[PDB]
Amino acid sequence: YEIQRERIELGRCIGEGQFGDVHQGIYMSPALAVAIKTCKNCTSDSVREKFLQEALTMRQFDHPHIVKLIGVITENPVWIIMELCTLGELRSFLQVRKYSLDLASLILYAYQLSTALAYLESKRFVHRDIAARNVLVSSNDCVKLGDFGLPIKWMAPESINFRRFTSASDVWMFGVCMWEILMHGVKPFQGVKNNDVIGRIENGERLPMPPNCPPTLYSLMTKCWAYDPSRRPRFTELKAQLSTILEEEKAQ
């Protein structure tokens, strides 16, 4: 896990994080383009602990659609080395590339995320924050699930009401994330108060069917939004049905 500083060449700043700047760079073991998370106040054991907790958590996972931890440099200045997702945040990608993106690409992103989530569920790991803002774009045909973070408008009723986060609450959030992708990065319940969401969910109200979303895909989203968590499908079901929906779109 520990990387020698020499094997890392530091490039341009690609944005800011909670503890410091995020830079892009290259790592040689062949030759990989990487993301480098820095930490300004990591001389403080307290700040170093919180900063390096990200590496501790990410180490256990290995999936093609989950952001990969390359390693860590624990000597000061402490850095976290991540796999680089060059096309950045999914929300901006979808907004910018809206008229360059076909339905088949949007379903591909939803499918790839369901495979990432089926893997997390296979490990008995609950993400707790599934939203398009936590997805990065590696390439035009490739998205990765991460965690860069209350998101009431994405949350299952039991998470709102009782702070209950389970595999079933993850499925609810995934349905909202799927709606965001097909809405090209448009946020759910726009111009609606976080207190007005709770009331609408209880009454039976759900996010409307996105324009040009196949009705089969929308039927899948509504299954994720079953009020009763025990009636929600699991990610193995979602992965299989998204695969079928993807082939129906690829075979026009």
Ligand SMILES: Cc1ccc(-n2nc(C(C)(C)C)cc2NC(=O)Nc2ccc(-c3cccnc3)cc2)cc1
């Ligand atoms: C406390 C804590 C916080 C986050 C995580 N955490 N957990 C995950 C899952 C495996 C559950 C999806 C991913 C991350 N971190 C992350 O996604 N980090 C990350 C940050 C930046 C980039 C990045 C930024 C810009 C360009 N390329 C990559 C990639 C991954 C674990 C613990």
